[PDB]
């Protein structure tokens, strides 16, 4: 899902910002197993490994 | 009901504007153009400052 982040000027006029995957990134069951999360030692961790 | 439509319209007004805008929180006043009375307090002795 997207996120509001915060707002930006455009041609004198305040747009907002928003950002998500890819869209070829989340189509899937299976592509939901792209994303990592960050171990606290450092290196990443898959995300079918536990959820 | 001249501020009460002022203040409707300006609540349609504030999800465009920046979130510091939002979370400060404007005021939505009657306004009168002249000054009826100035009231103001001086010091006699020089004691106490501006």
Same mark, same amino acid.
């Given at each position: 899902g997207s996120s509001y982040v915060n707002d930006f000027i455009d041609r004198g006029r305040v747009k907002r910002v928003y950002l998500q995957?890819?869209?070829d990134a989340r189509m899937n069951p299976d592509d939901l197993s792209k994303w990592y999360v960050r171990n606290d030692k450092g290196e990443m961790v898959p995300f079918n490994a536990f959820a | 009901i001249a501020q009460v439509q002022v203040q409707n319209k300006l609540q349609l007004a $504030?999800? %465009?504007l920046p979130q510091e805008v939002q979370?400060?929180?404007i005021r939505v006043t009657k306004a =009168?153009?002249?000054? %009826?009375?100035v009231v103001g307090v =001086?010091? $006699?002795?020089?004691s106490m400052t501006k």
């Open positions: 995957g890819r869209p | $504030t999800p %465009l979370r400060q929180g =009168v153009k002249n000054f %009826l009375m =001086v010091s $006699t002795d020089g």
